[PDB]
Amino acid sequence: GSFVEMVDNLRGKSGQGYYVEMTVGSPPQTLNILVDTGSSNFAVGAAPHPFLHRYYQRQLSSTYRDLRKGVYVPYTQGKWEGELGTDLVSIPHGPNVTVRANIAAITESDKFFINGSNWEGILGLAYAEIARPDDSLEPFFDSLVKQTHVPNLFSLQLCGAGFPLNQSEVLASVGGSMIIGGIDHSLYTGSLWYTPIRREWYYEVIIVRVEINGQDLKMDCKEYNYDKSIVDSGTTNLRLPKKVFEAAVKSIKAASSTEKFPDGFWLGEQLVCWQAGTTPWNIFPVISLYLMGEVTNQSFRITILPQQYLRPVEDVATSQDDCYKFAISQSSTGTVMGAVIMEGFYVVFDRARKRIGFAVSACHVHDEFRTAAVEGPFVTLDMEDCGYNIPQTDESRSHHHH
Ligand SMILES: NC1=N[C@@]2(c3cccc(-c4cncc(Cl)c4)c3)CCCC[C@H]2O1
Ligand code: NI
């Protein structure tokens, strides 16, 4: 029940993602790799870039094989492209195994790498369905499971910062654990509650109810999952569908109304500050997301604090003060349970049993009045289906799946 060698194997800078050290090639070349449950490609910088201190040198690897195939991956806010191949991959502070995995060698990118994030690649931990160029490119975790005896499960403890902050010139350092192949009981307290993975593509889940300070938002529950809800270590914020975001902000504004913040704050474009150590946490409400349980008609709630959704940023010009960014934001692609949610909890990606576990994280940030919580069961007599069915494009329909 112990996985000591994998504890504290994640690092990062606040808001710039959590990375794990990996080696690629023979002999092993060290790279820091973003841990991303919201994508499904293993892709690494493989050429010089202003924001890279180092990169994967295919030519230096005796075990590298070229797949003679390129890949082009555009996102909303950036893009990367490169050449597909395979090589030997290991996680030094992970299981004592080495696997031959697909690797996209990133040769050109725009707005993908981040200055000072200290990572050089991305480890997509989601399913084949959303891999590029297509679902025939086996993701890393699938290879790991197929080639080794590693159980088909991983778990994440993301630990946020962290006031008072160490530094004024750089962003706050963060830490965490990625436990590959099991569950480490020292990383959580209390009960572990499981929600079904609705479909294996993203880690998609269903939210059945939302409360802000114990007040039901009272929307049709399909609105909470429009057009999907996913658990995503590669997103910083809690992102909410437009209508849900508007209702949440209205509610949080109402609770915190003793303080009149500029509109820029609610848009996540401006910091708000209090004198060191005087932040009035109690005027900001807790937020509860009820997730579908394993049993029909059951749910459980995960409850986060303002300490999760107000992100600390130490401004140089006002290091006298504790300043915060509002880290709930609008989505047009459904709910994204990012680091804002995940930093509250130990999260178990139980692929073997098509479910996601949540328990209170032994490292979550709290005060003496309130804690992040995982609580259940809650039962509802006559349950609506809260899942949304994405309109089927002819594009998507025409695909064959041999
Ligand atoms: N899930 C997730 N991963 C990204 C991505 C790409 C590059 C950088 C990041 C990233 C940047 N800053 C902070 C984080 Cl946590 C991730 C994320 C790739 C897939 C779609 C958009 C992003 O959503
Ligand atoms: Ni066919």
Picking from 233, 194, 229, the residue whose alpha carbon sits closest to that of residue 352 is: 194
Asked if residue 217 lies in contact with residue 247, where contact means CB atoms within 8 angstroms, the answer is yes
Asked if residue 358 lies in contact with residue 192, where contact means CB atoms within 8 angstroms, the answer is yes
Q: Residue by residue, what is the 3-state secondary structure of the chain?
A: CCCHHHCCCEEEECCCCEEEEEEECCCCEEEEEEEECCCCCEEEECCCCCCCCCCCCHHHCCCCEEEEEEEEEECCCCEEEEEEEEEEEECCCCCCCCEEEEEEEEEEEECCCCCCCCCCEEEECCCHHHCCCCCCCCCHHHHHHHHCCCCCCEEEEEECCCCCCCCCCCCCEEEEEEEECCCCHHHEEEEEEEEECCCECCEEECEEEEEECCEECCCCHHHHHCCCEEECCCCCCEEEEHHHHHHHHHHHHHHCCCCCCCHHHHCCCCCEEEECCCCCHHHCCCEEEEEECCCCCEEEEEEECHHHHEEECCCHHHCCEEEEEECEEEECCCEEECHHHHCCEEEEEECCCCEEEEEEECCCCCCCCCCCEEEEEEECCCCCCCCCCCCCCHHHHHCCCC
Integer Cα distance of 14 and 365 in angstroms? 14
Q: Which ligand is nearest to the CA of 399?
A: 2
Picking from 236, 385, 209, the residue whose alpha carbon sits closest to that of residue 303 is: 209
* Domain 151-402 part of CATH 3.90.1150.10: no
Q: Is 36 a catalytic residue?
A: yes
Integer Cα distance of 208 and 257 in angstroms? 28
The one catalytic residue among 87, 184, 232, 322: 232
Instruction: Tell me if the bond preceding 227 is cis, omega within 30° of 0.
Output: yes
Residues 6+ away with beta carbon under 8 Å from 253: 266
Asked if residue 99 lies in contact with residue 89, where contact means CB atoms within 8 angstroms, the answer is yes
Q: Which ligand is nearest to the CA of 402?
A: 2
Q: Which ligand is nearest to the CA of 171?
A: 1
Asked if residue 126 lies in contact with residue 212, where contact means CB atoms within 8 angstroms, the answer is no
Asked if residue 316 lies in contact with residue 167, where contact means CB atoms within 8 angstroms, the answer is no
Resolution (A): 1.7
Asked if residue 118 lies in contact with residue 32, where contact means CB atoms within 8 angstroms, the answer is yes
What distance in angstroms lies between residue 256's CA and the mean position of ligand 2's atoms?
57
Measured between alpha carbons, how far is residue 370 from residues 47, 157, 284 in Å? 48, 20, 11
What distance in angstroms lies between residue 339's CA and the mean position of ligand 1's atoms?
11
What distance in angstroms lies between residue 399's CA and the mean position of ligand 2's atoms?
8
Tokens of 312: 């600390």
Pocket test for ligand 1, best of 36, 80, 158, 233 (most atoms within 8 A of CB): 36
Measure the CA dihedral 149/155/161/166, to 10°.
Answer: -10
Query: Which residue matches tokens 């989505």?
Result: 331
Chain breaks in the chain (C to N over 2.5 A) after: none
Tokens of 120: 């050089």
Residue having the nearest C-alpha atom to atom 19 of ligand 1: 39
Measured between alpha carbons, how far is residue 282 from residues 118, 278, 357 in Å? 35, 11, 28
Residue type, 363: C
Q: Which ligand is nearest to the CA of 131?
A: 1
What distance in angstroms lies between residue 265's CA and the mean position of ligand 1's atoms?
22
What is the distance of C-alpha 320 from the center of its chain?
31
Residue having the nearest C-alpha atom to atom 20 of ligand 1: 75
151-402 and 18-150 share a CATH fold = yes
Pocket test for ligand 1, best of 19, 34, 111, 127 (most atoms within 8 A of CB): 34
- Give the number of the atom of ligand 1 that is nearest the alpha carbon of residue 338: 15
The one catalytic residue among 36, 321, 322, 350: 36
Residue 75: what are its φ and ψ, rounded to 5°?
-105, -175
- Give the number of the atom of ligand 1 that is nearest the alpha carbon of residue 236: 15
Residues 6+ away with beta carbon under 8 Å from 74: none
Q: Is 263 a catalytic residue?
A: no
What distance in angstroms lies between residue 401's CA and the mean position of ligand 2's atoms?
7
Q: What's the chain's length in residues?
A: 402
Neighbouring C-alpha atoms within 13 Å toward the C-beta of 207 = 31
Query: Strand pairing of 328-331 and 238-241?
Result: parallel
Integer Cα distance of 233 and 27 in angstroms? 30
What distance in angstroms lies between residue 234's CA and the mean position of ligand 1's atoms?
5
Instruction: Tell me if the bond preceding 133 is cis, omega within 30° of 0.
Output: yes
Angle at 367 (CA atoms; ends 301, 155), nearest 5 degrees? 50
What distance in angstroms lies between residue 266's CA and the mean position of ligand 1's atoms?
22
Picking from 101, 114, 92, the residue whose alpha carbon sits closest to that of residue 143 is: 101
Integer Cα distance of 83 and 97 in angstroms? 25
Cross-strand bridge partners of residue 44? 105, 121
Integer Cα distance of 238 and 392 in angstroms? 27
Residue having the nearest C-alpha atom to atom 12 of ligand 1: 16
Picking from 134, 125, 172, 170, the residue whose alpha carbon sits closest to that of residue 152 is: 125
Residues lining ligand 1, CB < 6 A? Answer: 16-17, 36, 38-39, 75, 112, 114, 232, 234-236
Residue having the nearest C-alpha atom to atom 16 of ligand 1: 234
Integer Cα distance of 176 and 160 in angstroms? 8
Locate the domains of the chain by residue range.
Answer: 18-150, 151-402
Query: Strand pairing of 99-110 and 42-45?
Result: parallel
User: For 310-334, b where at least 16 C-beta lie within 10 A, e where not — what string?
Assistant: bbbbbeeeeeebbbbbbbbbbbeeb
Radius of gyration of the chain (CA): 21
Measured between alpha carbons, how far is residue 254 from residues 109, 140, 261, 268, 364 in Å? 43, 45, 12, 18, 26
Quick one: 18-150 is in which CATH superfamily?
Answer: Acid Proteases (2.40.70.10)
Residue having the nearest C-alpha atom to atom 21 of ligand 1: 75
Tokens of 191: 């009960």
Integer Cα distance of 402 and 70 in angstroms? 22
Residue having the nearest C-alpha atom to atom 6 of ligand 1: 112
Pocket test for ligand 1, best of 235, 238, 239, 340 (most atoms within 8 A of CB): 235
